[PDB]
Design a protein around this ligand. Structure first.
Ligand SMILES: Cc1cc2nc3c(=O)[nH]c(=O)nc-3n(C[C@H](O)[C@H](O)[C@H](O)COP(=O)(O)OP(=O)(O)OC[C@H]3O[C@@H](n4cnc5c(N)ncnc54)[C@H](O)[C@@H]3O)c2cc1C
Ligand SMILES: Cc1cc(C(=O)O)ccc1O
Length: 391
């Protein structure tokens, strides 16, 4: 097989890059280890920045999102008996966020890719990269018993955190920045109407809680839990009871509960690798970095990475200077770290940390009081929440 850009992974990163390159005229093929049904089996929600929204329109996959998508002009933070709404639209200057799940985005992208007949190879196992600093890089994999080879000019590592792409770079070339938080999120997806038309973050002494949406008949809730916890010790019953205890009464009153469609515990991690590339290999999305989901930034960061790689690959294949591709890591990392900072801040002020002292609690409380009580403070949250202007 011959292509111009070999893409590893058919997640939202790889698919979006694939479709963007398609419109541009750049040949590309995607290799996915799992099956389409499995990738779509991944039930992850989604809050979208306008940057990602507009990027889906440019890729031509905006029709269904324009229909099923839900716009939020604001978001709520609850703490210390208070409920404070952040007017995102007003504070950021017209900008908003979009409720549209990653599962839907991934579906939409697949449909556009199948519809246009672009190349995608699922069940591609033992994926291995070759000659990365060489001039004829190539990929090798096995499906249906046969061993194939995909020749290429460039390789896009969009194979997520546990992908082979990052592990294909010599470790001596990479520096890893990592923070593991002492808690996880116990999440529950239910076929119930959301308690609020905007999302609600809650800092409660018992722990963090989050009320979120998917459709308008499907809700997504989280409560922070210790990593000592196992999902089997948490009935739907126990979940709703804890969630209600961590919410304002006037919210818990209005809360429609129900059976769990999905119930899982997710650990919170920060992760960044520098640089994000090696020769003809470019990492994007979870392959390069992880954020705690408190900021809802991982998928949006994946988008910005892909947007940068797409536009550099354009100026490369067109203007014959595949040298601007050296600027990939520096450009992405500037935005990645700003996302890591906000996601870290959000996590730091909304969660309860073990073995913290009285001073830390008061500082956390004062952080919320100041930033939610100041027009400037509110603006710093808002502009980060909707997404800072692209680079
Ligand atoms: C609970 C939770 C809530 C979140 N909420 C938000 C939110 O509200 N807003 C937001 O912007 N982000 C959110 N995120 C972040 C988002 O889910 C991820 O950042 C996003 O999935 C990253 O996409 P990706 O394509 O880079 O990686 P992935 O989605 O993991 O895709 C990687 C693909 O590559 C495949 N693959 C792996 N290894 C190989 C291999 N060797 N060979 C071939 N293929 C391979 C995988 O099967 C997979 O299909 C949330 C995350 C979690 C866990
Ligand atoms: C607001 C938000 C929502 C989700 C979700 O919809 O699951 C995850 C993380 C978030 O910060």
């Amino acid at each position: 097989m011959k292509t111009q850009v070999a893409i590893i992974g058919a997640g939202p990163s790889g698919l979006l890059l694939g479709q963007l390159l398609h419109k541009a005229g750049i040949d590309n093929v995607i290799l996915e280890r799992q099956t389409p049904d499995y990738v779509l089996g991944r039930i992850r929600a989604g809050m979208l920045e306008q940057g990602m929204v507009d990027l889906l329109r440019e890729a031509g996959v905006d029709r269904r999102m324009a229909r099923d998508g839900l716009v939020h002009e604001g978001v709520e933070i609850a703490f210390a008996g208070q409920r404070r709404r952040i007017d995102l639209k007003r504070l950021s200057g017209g900008k908003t966020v979009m409720v549209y799940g990653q599962t839907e985005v991934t579906r939409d992208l697949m449909e556009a890719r199948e519809a246009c007949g672009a190349t995608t190879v699922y069940q591609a196992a033992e994926v291995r990269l070759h000659d990365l600093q060489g001039e004829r890089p190539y990929v090798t994999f096995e499906r249906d018993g046969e061993r194939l080879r995909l020749d290429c000019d460039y390789i896009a590592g969009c194979d997520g955190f546990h992908g082979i792409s990052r592990q294909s770079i010599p470790a001596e070339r990479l520096k890893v920045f990592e923070r593991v938080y002492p808690f996880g999120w116990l999440g529950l997806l239910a076929d119930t109407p959301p308690v609020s038309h905007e999302n609600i973050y809650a800092n409660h002494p018992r722990g963090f809680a989050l009320c979120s949406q998917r459709s308008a008949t499907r809700s997504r809730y989280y409560v922070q839990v210790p990593l000592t916890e196992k999902v089997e010790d948490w009935s739907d019953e126990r979940f709703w009871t804890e969630l209600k205890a961590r919410l304002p009464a006037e919210v818990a009153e209005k809360l429609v509960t129900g059976p769990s469609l999905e119930k899982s515990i997710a650990p919170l991690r920060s992760f960044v690798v520098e640089p994000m590339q090696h020769g003809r290999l470019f990492l994007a999305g979870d392959a390069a970095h992880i954020v705690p989901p408190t900021g809802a930034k991982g998928l949006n960061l994946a988008a910005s990475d892909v947007s940068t790689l797409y536009r550099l690959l354009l100026k490369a294949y067109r203007e014959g200077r595949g040298e601007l591709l050296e600027r990939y890591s520096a450009i992405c990392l500037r935005r990645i770290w700003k996302a890591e900072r906000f996601s870290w801040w959000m996590t730091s002020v909304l969660h309860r940390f073990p073995d913290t002292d009285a001073f830390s609690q008061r500082i956390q409380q004062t952080e919320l009081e100041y930033y939610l009580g100041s027009e400037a403070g509110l603006a710093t949250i808002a502009e980060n929440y909707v997404g800072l202007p692209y680079e």
